[PDB]
Amino acid sequence: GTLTGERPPVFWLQGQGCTGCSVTLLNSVHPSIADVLLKVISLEFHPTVMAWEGEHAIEHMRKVAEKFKGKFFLVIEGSVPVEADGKYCIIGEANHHEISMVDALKEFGPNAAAVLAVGTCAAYGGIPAAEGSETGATAVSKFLGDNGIKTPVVNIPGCPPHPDWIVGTVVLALDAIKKNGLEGGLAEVVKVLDSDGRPTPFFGRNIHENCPYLDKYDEGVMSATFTDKVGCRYDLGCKGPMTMADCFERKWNGGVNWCVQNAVCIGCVEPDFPDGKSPFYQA
Amino acid sequence: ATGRTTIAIDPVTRIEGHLKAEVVVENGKVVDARLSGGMYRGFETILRGRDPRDASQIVQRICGVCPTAHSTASVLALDEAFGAKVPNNGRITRNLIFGANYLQSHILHFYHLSAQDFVQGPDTAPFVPRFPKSDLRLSKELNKAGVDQYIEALEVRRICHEMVALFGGRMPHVQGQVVGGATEIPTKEKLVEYAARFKKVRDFVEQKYVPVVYTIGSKYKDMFKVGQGFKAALCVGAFPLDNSGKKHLFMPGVYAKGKDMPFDPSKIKEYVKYSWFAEETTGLNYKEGKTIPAPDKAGAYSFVKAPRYDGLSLEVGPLARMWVNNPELSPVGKKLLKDLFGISAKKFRDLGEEAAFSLMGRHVARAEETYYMLGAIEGWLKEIKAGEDTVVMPAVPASAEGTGFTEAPRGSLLHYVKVKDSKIDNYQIVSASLWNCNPRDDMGQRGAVEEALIGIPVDDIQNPVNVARLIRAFDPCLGCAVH
Ligand code: SF4
Ligand code: SF4
Ligand code: FCO
Ligand SMILES: [Fe+2]
Ligand code: NI
Ligand SMILES: [S]
């Protein structure tokens, strides 16, 4: 990119998130996050990093949204809680009126070019929707569907996702749009999503079938302590067999480690995370 | 002479999580304040019924900026409950995992959250638009140094997360801390990799970060004269330096009404009159804590409970820890205090109570603490033994309890777990930004940041920049505060 190139507007709204999906993106190696912000996208609203604040920040987003109606990208980080008339997540206040996450998604969702549900919470409900919760935490695609909102959704799950999955899905979409225009481009993106809405370049391969300890699994050679790095981690709770992600190859944090080498995979990109992947430390 | 204006800010930006601030301004100064944490998840109820070992993964999702802190508190609570005896080398490995994220978090806070309070960024989103009169005082050269350092700090904080991941697996959300220790023995080769990254971080902290905080501070000397609040602080201890549980890098203590006092955790109670929880749960110590949301309860204004220490409203964080422990100041802090401020100082308390407990004093304390952590990490790199085991594998108990105490980058953190029938019966969390960003208690006493807002200058109601500047000095993380 260039400082002088075309950069589409992005609004990043946090519902029931932990900010981990923003922090993971800050860890992008190639392109660096500086290059993403200055050369790839125009991040017009993001509560963690933007200059302005309060009702002024909300109104700035609304002004951009009107100018780019149908064309902005809406990132959602966290689930959307529907109980108690939306009161479990208030994201702002303007005109003396509080704005719940429910309100915000109903306002901006219909007018986005696409909604990127970043993280397992936004994609599938995640920890806020797990057993023992009581806020009505809802995944983005389900909330939009329940409310008659037809805007395309792309899920980029993980708790957190790898930065390469987030940046790479943006690049996939921008490439498709450059070639085909907005509607033709988004149609080409949808064609490369799996049944759980995940881009197959990143989520189309199984961890276990590509794992370097697979020979030990087949031999029945299982580590009995976490620090034994020779054996397979299945008896310690590894969920690699049920997990679709490319972590075995790209690894984490500049390639320095990944979950299976260090401890176990907990299945963090899967629709049933956490409850269907728990207990974490037994098979 | 002017009358009242009431100013609501939602969202407060360049913090973590969901915060509304409402201040009453009269005659150019804040005279009242209310802070509202506006998002709830309910980790304390989600955790019930699970295998206790799952907690050290689940709890990290309270917050993606500080997950190693919750990981640490959780494994310490599980260690106690299970009777797990962490091997010496595992204690040190944990300190290397967690200490690297102190570096990440403080650098993120100063540059990527706070620095735009004083620095104009480039003329493109997310750096514009902003208040037309933003009170940005730096020369063209020093403003450009701030921008250049903001950009460099994006790389440095990423390198800090590589350091975390070397023995932690990945970051955010480490895999490498469990009950019984750390899951990966450090190898000679990976210790070389950690040290090489650490050198780059050290150089940035010593040469860029600590000097820029004092230098920017010297252009905002008025910001050392406001934001005192209660001038009351808490530290619960963190980073064990041996296997006795009695010696720590940060030692515990309370400071209030000009006096040092011991820390007794039985004196913690969480009040809820002004919080969205059932009235019958007010005033509980964490060992008997309850979390029963009441989002429609009249008069309440926050999902943050109100913790009080023997009735006192205390703050937490780098200022709190550095004031309680009173370490020697960094060489470059000593020099710049003399050169730029005319202050002769050797130890942290030589700043004096008023300047330390101030808006800019909290930024200085955080920079000094970052420098202090460098020496701790250097010591752990000498102490660790490549190849020595870092974990034990304990059986899950049927019936047990435990408490883990540590210091997250933003302040004091404890997790309490009670196990019954081999499952979590209760899990209670009392976190750093809980201590800072809470609402009034049942007696009407304000939370620490609410009180620190009193007296903040608002000479221009149309550009009320100092309200959120004060809030940002405390590095709020509302995901932690509410959980
Ligand atoms: S370590 Fe996990 S992913 Fe690898 S072979 Fe064993 S069970 Fe499969
Ligand atoms: S290895 Fe498993 S737990 Fe780790 S990031 Fe990949 S999918 Fe998530
Ligand atoms: N640091 C941090 Fe997060 C907060 N507040 C915790 O604990
Ligand atoms: Fe709590
Ligand atoms: Ni946090
Ligand atoms: S942390």
As to burial, measured by CB atoms within 10 angstroms (0-12 exposed, 13-18 middle, 19+ buried), residue A56 is middle
Nearest atom in ligand 3 to B437's CA: 5
Q: Does A91 touch chain B (CB under 8 A)?
A: yes
Same domain, residue pair A146 and A235: no
Long-range pairs for A139-142: beta carbons < 8 A, 24 or more residues apart: A139/A79, A139/A80, A140/A76, A140/A80, A140/A105, A140/A115, A141/A117, A141/A197
> Which of B407, B302, B399, B419 is closest to B47 using CA atoms?
B419
Same domain, residue pair A213 and A87: no
> Cβ(B420)–Cβ(B401) under 8 Å?
no
> Cβ(B337)–Cβ(B329) under 8 Å?
yes
Alpha-carbon distance of B407 to B73, in angstroms, equals 9
* Residue B469 CA: distances (Å) to CA of B213, B439, B456: 15, 19, 10
Dihedral sign, Cα of residue B83, residue B87, residue B91, residue B97: negative
> Cβ(A222)–Cβ(A215) under 8 Å?
no
Same domain, residue pair A107 and A218: no
The CATH number given to whatever domain includes residue A93 is 3.40.50.700
Alpha-carbon distance of A176 to A172, in angstroms, equals 6
Q: Flag if A20 and B64 touch (Cβ within 8 Å).
A: yes
As to burial, measured by CB atoms within 10 angstroms (0-12 exposed, 13-18 middle, 19+ buried), residue A242 is middle
Same domain, residue pair A142 and A224: no
Ligand nearest, relative to CA of residue A164: 2
Same domain, residue pair A163 and A271: no
End residue of a domain, out of A159, A177, A202: A202
Experimental method: X-ray
Same domain, residue pair A99 and A213: no
For chain B, the first-to-last Cα distance in angstroms comes to 43
Name residues whose C-beta falls within 8 Å of residue B167's C-beta, 6 or more positions apart in sequence.
A257, A262, B93, B96, B97, B176, B182, B184, B186, B190, B194
> Which of B82, B41, B83 is closest to B63 using CA atoms?
B41
The Cα of A149 is separated from the nearest Cα of chain B by a number of Å equal to 24
Same domain, residue pair A52 and A139: yes
Determine phi and psi for B22, rounding to 5 degrees: -125, 125
Looking at this protein, which amino acid is placed at residue A75? V
Alpha-carbon distance of B51 to B179, in angstroms, equals 12
The CATH number given to whatever domain includes residue A223 is 4.10.480.10
Q: At what angle do helices B359-383 and B318-325 cross, to 10 degrees?
A: 70
Cα torsion A217, A222, A225, A227 to 10°: value is -50
Same domain, residue pair A277 and A256: yes
Q: Is A259 annotated as a binding residue?
A: yes
Domains recognised in chain B with CATH numbers: 1-483 (1.10.645.10)
> Cβ(A108)–Cβ(A11) under 8 Å?
yes
Same domain, residue pair A192 and A258: no
Looking at this protein, which amino acid is placed at residue A214? L
Whether B69 is in the pocket of ligand 3, judged by its Cβ within 6 Å, is yes
Same domain, residue pair A272 and A196: no
Q: Does A160 touch chain B (CB under 8 A)?
A: yes
Q: Helix/strand/coil (H, E, C) string of chain B?
A: CCCEEEEEECCCCCCECCEEEEEEEECCEEEEEEEEECECCCHHHHCCCCCHHHHHHHHHHHCCCCHHHHHHHHHHHHHHHHCCCCCHHHHHHHHHHHHHHHHHHHHHHHHHHHHHHCCCCCCCCCCCCCCCCCCCCCCHHHHHHHHHHHHHHHHHHHHHHHHHHHHHCCCCCCCCEECCEECCCCCHHHHHHHHHHHHHHHHHHHHHHHHHHHHHHHCCHHHHCCCCCCCCEEECCEEECCCCCCCEEECCEEEECCEEECCCHHHEEEECCCECECHHHCCECHHHCCCCECCCCCCCCECCCEEEECCECCECCHHHHHHHHCCECCHHHHHHHHHHHCCCCCEHHHHCHHHHCCHHHHHHHHHHHHHHHHHHHHHHHHHCCCCCCCECCCCCCCCEEEEEEEEECCEEEEEEEEEECCEEEEEEEECHHHHHCCCCCCCCCCCHHHHHCCCCECCCCCCCHHHHHHHHHCCCEHHHHHC
Same domain, residue pair A89 and A185: yes
Q: Which residues have C-beta atoms less than 6 Å from ligand 1? A: A 207-208, 211, 213-214, 217, 232-234, 238, 240-241, 260, 265
End residue of a domain, out of A202, A231, A256: A202
Question: Which residue(s) pair with B444 in the sheet?
Answer: none
User: Which residues 51-90 of chain B have a CB within 8 Å of chain A?
Assistant: 51, 53-54, 57-58, 61-65, 67
Q: Does B472 touch chain A (CB under 8 A)?
A: no
User: Which residues 185-244 of chain A have a CB within 8 Å of chain B?
Assistant: 224-227, 229
Alpha-carbon distance of B470 to B410, in angstroms, equals 15
Structural domain boundaries enclosing A135: 1-202
Model resolution, angstroms: 1.4
Name residues whose C-beta falls within 8 Å of residue A96's C-beta, 6 or more positions apart in sequence.
none
Pairing of strands A9-14, A72-77: parallel
Q: Could you tell me the strand order of the sheet in which B29-37 lies?
A: B4-9, B19-26, B29-37
Structure tokens at A164: 């390469």
Q: Which residues of A touch B129 (CB under 8 A)?
A: 51-52, 56, 60
Work out how many domains chain A is built from and give that number: 2
Name residues whose C-beta falls within 8 Å of residue A34's C-beta, 6 or more positions apart in sequence.
B151, B154
Name residues whose C-beta falls within 8 Å of residue B33's C-beta, 6 or more positions apart in sequence.
B21, B22, B23, B24, B446, B449, B450, B451, B453, B454
Alpha-carbon distance of A20 to A118, in angstroms, equals 10
End residue of a domain, out of A187, A202, A217: A202
CB nearest to B53's CB, from A126, A257, A279:
A279
Same domain, residue pair A221 and A209: yes
